[PDB]
């Protein structure tokens, strides 16, 4: 019966809420009310990368923390050498409407996707010397919002058809379709161990998925609007999700609830992209107010402002070694901060 | 700088030259968003002047255009329309012949979208001949779906085609007036709506888009000079 199923669902949700409140022994602010503040950190624009014709919508660091891929909504995927501002590669794209790009951990492949409902995997290392389409993964009935490489063969893409998908580049077929979100998934962050990944959707909900055994392990609510960005804490037991409600939140997988809420009364814009520092003490969130904000992840105190972008900040990402942050905005500029 | 470093800088400079050549084309091409409903006539228009997103490159008067039609998507449009905050115009196609209120609401949240405040809308009222040959018959009454039709007179600034009954002109201009009443309200002058009448078989549609894109660009350039 539909009514009894709805009643059972409501009872289960009430039980989940009660269990979550039971574990709320204290707050992260109370536990970390004695640690010294990180201070007023100040990172300046050490390098501005120009050459993108249109608004940059995605950017991903390489494993070596020297190469940087950036996708612009002009049909261009540019791989830069972040140390020397040099452009290592300029890949034309079949579709000029691109919202995501992923750099493989090995550095031999680069992904992109957008309103073409297709994940294009390009082979950087080829005997022919050029970058060519290695694969065109299709099967998503909607725009691809984010993509992340597990390895040289497996990529997981969250697309605006309320689904994520673990693919298989060799066969070009979906290996596991993660369903359960009621709205378009905007971003997904891979756990460092690659066993799990969390994806936030336009339903004010993030969801943890087991990549091997495809299912939603945990669901996290608390946001009042669409989650635009999700990032995984370096430890891998927590993740920060920013929404277009001028709020980021830190959720612990073990506590299964929000730990801290980063927000300010002077902030009315929406978070577009979120990244964590290597230590996890700093949470860098790009907003719609043309500047990013550095938050104390353990105290909910704003620690800095990465002002300098003339348009909305679309993406920001920390290096694997934590050396420098990169920020791509709609002003067609990539800025590196230290 | 070593030899390989210098050669890498040379590769970067060649990439920059190619990017400049590509910019010479990107800045000279005007992007448009083809929006509408399933029973609107978008497919007929894209078939004229000649899954994912579909790109149609139509050039008239020696200026290239790029019309993008969004397909294989869902009702949640707000999260991909942000990608179109820099296009020249949104060609919004409406079937003038039941679901007219649904299409009128669809015109809102596109006119009133916070990412399209400076985005002009070229409004196409497609398949006007269906309305023409449907309104002579009394089977369907426009006043039945829209009550404020009897208490409405045809505008003085109307240019009916030679051979059009007054009822046809009154109905089509009532639909247009509904759309422009939605458009002008909550409009700060940053973007303008340009209504047109089409029958889905008209070689002039590309010319209308041309003449309207030139007007949009003209007003934006004038605004850059603080002349308007």
């Amino acid at each position, epitope marked *: 019966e539909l009514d009894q199923l709805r009643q059972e669902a409501e009872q289960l949700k009430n039980q989940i809420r009660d269990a979550r409140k039971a574990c709320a022994d204290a707050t992260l602010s109370q536990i970390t009310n004695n640690i010294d503040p990180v201070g007023r950190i100040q990172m300046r624009t050490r390098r501005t990368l120009r050459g993108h014709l249109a608004k940059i919508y995605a950017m991903h660091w390489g494993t070596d923390s*020297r*190469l940087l891929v950036s996708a612009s909504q002009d049909g261009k995927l540019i791989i830069w*050498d972040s140390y*020397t501002t*040099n452009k*290592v*590669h300029a890949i034309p794209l079949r579709s000029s409407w691109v919202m995501t790009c992923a750099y493989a951990p090995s*550095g031999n492949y680069v992904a992109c996707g957008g309103l073409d409902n297709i994940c294009s995997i390009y082979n950087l*290392k080829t*005997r*022919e*010397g*050029n970058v060519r389409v290695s694969r065109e993964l299709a099967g998503h009935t909607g725009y691809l919002s984010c993509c992340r490489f597990l390895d040289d063969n497996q990529i997981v893409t969250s697309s605006g058809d309320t689904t994520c998908a673990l693919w298989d580049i060799e066969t070009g077929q979906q290996t596991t379709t993660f369903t359960g979100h009621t709205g378009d998934v905007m971003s997904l962050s891979l756990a460092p161990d690659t066993r799990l990944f969390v994806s936030g959707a336009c339903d004010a909900s993030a969801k943890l998925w087991d990549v091997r055994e495809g299912m939603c392990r945990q669901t996290f609510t608390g946001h009042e609007s669409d989650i635009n960005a999700i990032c995984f804490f370096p430890n891998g037991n927590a993740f920060a999700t920013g929404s277009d409600d001028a709020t980021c939140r830190l959720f612990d997988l073990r506590a299964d609830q929000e730990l801290m809420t980063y927000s300010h009364d002077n902030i009315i814009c929406g978070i577009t992209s979120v990244s964590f520092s290597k230590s996890g003490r700093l949470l860098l969130a790009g907003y719609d107010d043309f500047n990013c904000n550095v938050w104390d992840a353990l105290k909910a105190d704003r620690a800095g402002v990465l002002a300098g972008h003339d348009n909305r900040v679309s993406c920001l990402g920390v290096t694997d070694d934590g050396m420098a942050v990169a920020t791509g905005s709609w002003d067609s500029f990539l800025k590196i901060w230290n | 700088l*070593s*030899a*390989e*470093d*210098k*050669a*890498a800088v*040379e*590769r970067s*400079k*060649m990439i920059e030259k190619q990017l400049q050549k590509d910019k010479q084309v990107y800045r000279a091409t005007h992007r448009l968003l083809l929006l509408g409903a399933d029973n609107s006539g978008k497919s007929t228009i894209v078939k004229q002047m000649r899954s994912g997103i579909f790109e149609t490159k139509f050039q008239v008067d020696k200026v290239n255009f790029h019309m993008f039609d969004v397909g294989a998507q869902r009702d949640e449009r707000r999260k991909w329309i942000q990608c179109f905050n820099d296009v020249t115009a949104i060609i919004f196609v409406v079937d003038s012949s039941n679901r007219l209120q649904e299409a009128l609401n669809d015109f809102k949240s596109i006119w009133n979208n916070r990412w399209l405040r400076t985005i002009s809308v070229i409004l196409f009222l497609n398949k006007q001949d269906l309305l023409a040959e449907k309104v002579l018959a009394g089977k369907s009454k426009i006043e039945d779906y829209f009550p404020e039709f009897a208490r409405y007179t045809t505008p003085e600034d109307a240019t009916p085609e030679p051979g059009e009954d007054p009822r046809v002109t009154r109905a089509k201009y009532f639909i247009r007036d509904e759309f422009l009443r939605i458009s002008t309200a909550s409009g700060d002058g940053r973007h303008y709506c340009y209504p047109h009448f089409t029958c889905s078989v008209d070689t002039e549609n590309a010319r209308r888009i041309f003449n309207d894109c030139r007007d949009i660009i003209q007003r934006m350039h004038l605004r850059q000079y603080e002349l308007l």
Partner: single-chain antibody
Framework: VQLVESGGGLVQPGGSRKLSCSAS????????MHWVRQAPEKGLEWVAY????????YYADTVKGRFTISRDDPKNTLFLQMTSLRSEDTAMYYC??????????????WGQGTTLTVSSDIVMTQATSSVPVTPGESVSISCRSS???????????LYWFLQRPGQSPQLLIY???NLASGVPDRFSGSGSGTAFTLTISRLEAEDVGVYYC?????????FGAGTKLEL
């Protein structure tokens, strides 16, 4: 991905001849191309370099002015025009492709060569001119430099090439520790400024031949004498 080189033969001294190299299988435009010759029963000598886009053109000090290099990207063919020929210019002229970016593998592919029979610099020293080789054992070829090859970038521009009997040289190691594509994992490279060792573990057949060490820190590119491994 193959480069086939033609336009060579018997030339009277003082003559002029155009050496053509036609490429097929890779992007000619994005690849810089070098001409590197090898005199009979001698080592490897760099002759010329035409960069991607014909921007920087470099010539060896011994062929400067007499030789000119050019490329045709639409025709995918690289030309070496040779004027005022000398008897000290007889060699098998090899054409190599080298692309330059971060993580690139310059000098990755060589061609087949053309016989042209005619009727300061960073000196590379290879002390071992010949080394006995037994299959299954390990060997360590040594190379020395006249100046440190470790730039401020942290890259030690040393290249180890292998030339099998009757075959064109094949890239083995680039930047003094980097295994080239298709090269077995047994090969390794190590060393520091003005000292380099290439170690081959579990030496096998089809591995004998002449090993060459080359510098890429600054032009002109100078190779080594060549260490011969034979069974």
């Amino acid at each position: 991905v193959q480069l086939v080189e033609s336009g060579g033969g018997l030339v009277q001294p003082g003559g002029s001849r155009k050496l053509s190299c036609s490429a097929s299988g890779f992007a000619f435009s994005s690849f810089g191309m070098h001409w590197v010759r090898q005199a009979p029963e001698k080592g490897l000598e760099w002759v010329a370099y035409i960069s991607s886009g014909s921007g920087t053109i470099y010539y060896a000090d011994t062929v400067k002015g007499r030789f000119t290099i050019s490329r045709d990207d639409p025709k995918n063919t690289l030309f070496l025009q040779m004027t005022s020929l000398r008897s000290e210019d007889t060699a098998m002229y090899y054409c190599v492709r080298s692309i330059y970016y971060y993580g690139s593998s310059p000098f990755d592919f060589w061609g087949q060569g053309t016989t042209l029979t005619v009727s300061s610099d960073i000196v590379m020293t290879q002390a071992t001119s010949s080394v006995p080789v037994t299959p299954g054992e390990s060997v360590s070829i040594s190379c020395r430099s006249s100046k440190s090859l470790l730039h401020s970038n942290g890259n030690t521009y040393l290249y180890w090439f292998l030339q099998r009997p009757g075959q064109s040289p094949q890239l083995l190691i680039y930047r003094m520790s980097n295994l080239a594509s298709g090269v077995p994992d047994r090969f390794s490279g190590s060393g520091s400024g003005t000292a380099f060792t290439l170690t081959i573990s579990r030496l096998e057949a089809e591995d004998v031949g002449v090993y060459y060490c080359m510098q890429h820190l600054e032009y002109p590119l100078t190779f080594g004498a060549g260490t011969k491994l034979e069974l």
